[PDB]
Amino acid sequence: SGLSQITKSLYISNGVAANNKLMLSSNQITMVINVSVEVVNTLYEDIQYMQVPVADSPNSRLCDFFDPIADHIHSVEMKQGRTLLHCAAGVSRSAALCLAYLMKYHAMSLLDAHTWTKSCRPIIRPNSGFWEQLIHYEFQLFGKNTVHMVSSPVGMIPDIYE
Numbered sequence: 001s002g003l004s005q006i007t008k009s010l011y012i013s014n015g016v017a018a019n020n021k022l023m024l025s026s027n028q029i030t031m032v033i034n035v036s037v038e039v040v041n042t043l044y045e046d047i048q049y050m051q052v053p054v055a056d057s058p059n060s061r062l063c064d065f066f067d068p069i070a071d072h073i074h075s076v077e078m079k080q081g082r083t084l085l086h087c088a089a090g091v092s093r094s095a096a097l098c099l100a101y102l103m104k105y106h107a108m109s110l111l112d113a114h115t116w117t118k119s120c121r122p123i124i125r126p127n128s129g130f131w132e133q134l135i136h137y138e139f140q141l142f143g144k145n146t147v148h149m150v151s152s153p154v155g156m157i158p159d160i161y162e
Helices: 021-026 060-078 093-103 111-119 128-142
Strands: 004-007 010-013 031-032 050-051 083-086
Touching: 004 093, 004 111, 010 093, 031 060, 060 083, 060 093, 060 128, 083 093, 093 111, 093 128, 111 128
Parallel strands: 010 083, 031 050, 031 083
Antiparallel strands: 004 010
């Protein structure tokens, strides 16, 4: 239950780490973005909190928060702060917002944003609906895609998953 650092000012974690006061202060976290409906945050002093109430479902419109949250992460960085994006497990919901942010502010293709994030936090795995949303957002940002949904015995998956 630790913090996976993604950039100089962005981290991803599960719900346990997100309420670990020492871990937040030691990593100089100033902004906590809870991407879940169900996780409750303990509100520590001098840390700002907010919540994006989405369930980890392929139907959840996380996409409506791609741009607004990406800009929020960027503003925190501009103000010399650091942001922790977390959900319940730090696997699907927070990971998807992180990918959107990397594409918008680090000029990375969806594929490169995923390779990078996966290297920082091995267990990330957005659900298939979030992948479709990320692919649509990638197309919006670059007019081209580097990840594509394909059929499989388990249903639609990003080609990245084979």
